[PDB]
C-alpha cells in the first residue's frame, strides 16, 4: 500500500530586525530527506537521509533555487496577510504551507495536497478534487478569487498528479532498502505494583516504522478503555517510533488482560498477555 511525499514550510516574521525565519523540510512517508534553514551557513537545500546524497549537483542546484524562491514567496505572503488582517508591524506572525502527493497500493496517484495556515489556523486548502479551494475567511476568499482567475488549481494538478508522483517513485526505488522496509514493533509487557490490591500492566511497542500503530487493551476478550492510559507516538531518534499503553488491574487478575498491537509490519496482529 500507500506512500507519500510531503513538504512542510514555516516562515516567522521578525519585526525587531531582519528577514523572516524560514525552515523547509521534505519527507517520504515518516522519513525526513531534505531541509532548508534561512539561518544556516550553507544557504543550500541539504540532505537529511543518506539515500538522497546520490542525487548529483544539477538536483541540488535546482532544489536550492526553488527552496530560496519559496522563502521569498512566504516573506511576501507574510506582508500580504498582515495587510488583509489589518495587523500592525509590531507582532511576529507565522505562515505555514504543506504540499505533496500520495500513491496507492497500485503505485498510481491517490491524493494531492496544497494548503496553508496563518498564525496556526486554516487559511486556504486545495480540496481533494484538486479543482476548488476551501477559504476559511474573507482574507483567504481574496486569495481564492485571485487563484481561481489565474487557474492555480489546474497548474498544481500537473505537479501533484505528475512530477510529484514521478519523483516520489524515484526516491522510493533509490532509498528502497529503508523506505520500502517495514520495522514491526518489538513488543513486551512490564508489571508494576501500585498497592497490595492493584498493579499496572504496561504494553510496549518499540523501534517500529512507519509511525502509524494501534495498541488496545481487552479484558476477557472485550475492549477496555476504563483504567487505561497511553502516550502519543514519539520518535526514538534513529528514524523509528515508540508507544505504550497501560491498564490498572486487580492483583492476581493479570491473565484476564490482553494487549493487541496492529502495525503494517505485522502480517497478523500480536496479542500479549502477562503469563511470564
Amino acid at each position: 500500500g500507500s506512500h507519500s511525499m510531503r513538504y512542510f514550510f514555516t516562515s516567522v516574521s521578525r519585526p525587531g530586525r531582519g528577514e523572516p525565519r524560514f525552515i523547509a523540510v521534505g519527507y517520504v512517508d515518516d522519513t525526513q530527506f531534505v531541509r532548508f534553514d534561512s539561518d544556516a551557513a550553507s544557504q543550500r537545500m541539504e540532505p537529511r537521509a543518506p539515500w538522497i546524497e546520490q542525487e548529483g549537483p544539477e538536483y541540488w542546484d535546482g532544489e536550492t533555487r526553488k527552496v530560496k524562491a519559496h522563502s521569498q514567496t512566504h516573506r511576501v505572503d507574510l506582508g500580504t496577510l498582515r495587510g488583509y488582517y489589518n495587523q500592525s508591524e509590531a507582532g511576529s506572525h507565522t505562515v505555514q504551507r504543506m504540499y505533496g502527493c500520495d500513491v496507492g497500493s497500485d503505485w498510481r496517484f491517490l491524493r494531492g495536497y496544497h494548503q496553508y495556515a496563518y498564525d496556526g489556523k486554516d487559511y486556504i486548502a486545495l480540496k481533494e478534487d484538486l479543482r476548488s479551494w476551501t477559504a476559511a475567511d474573507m482574507a483567504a476568499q481574496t486569495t481564492k478569487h485571485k487563484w481561481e482567475a489565474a487557474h492555480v488549481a489546474e497548474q498544481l494538478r500537473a505537479y501533484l498528479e505528475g512530477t510529484c508522483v514521478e519523483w516520489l517513485r524515484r526516491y522510493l526505488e533509490n532509498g528502497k532498502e529503508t523506505l520500502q522496509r517495514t520495522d514491526a514493533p518489538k513488543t513486551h509487557m512490564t508489571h508494576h505494583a501500585v498497592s497490595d490490591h492493584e498493579a499496572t500492566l504496561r504494553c510496549w511497542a518499540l523501534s517500529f516504522y512507519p509511525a502509524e500503530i494501534t495498541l488496545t487493551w481487552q479484558r476477557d476478550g472485550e475492549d477496555q478503555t476504563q483504567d487505561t492510559e497511553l502516550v502519543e507516538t514519539r520518535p526514538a531518534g534513529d528514524g523509528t517510533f515508540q508507544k505504550w499503553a497501560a491498564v490498572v488491574v486487580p492483583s492476581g487478575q493479570e491473565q484476564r488482560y490482553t494487549c493487541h498491537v496492529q502495525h503494517e509490519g505485522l502480517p497478523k496482529p500480536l496479542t500479549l498477555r502477562w503469563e511470564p
Binding site: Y7, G26, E63, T73, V95, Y116, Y123, Y159, C164
Partner: peptide
C-alpha cells in the same frame, strides 16, 4: 522535488 511555479497569497 519541489514544485517549480510561483503562487502568491
Amino acid at each position: 522535488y519541489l514544485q517549480p511555479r510561483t503562487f502568491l497569497l
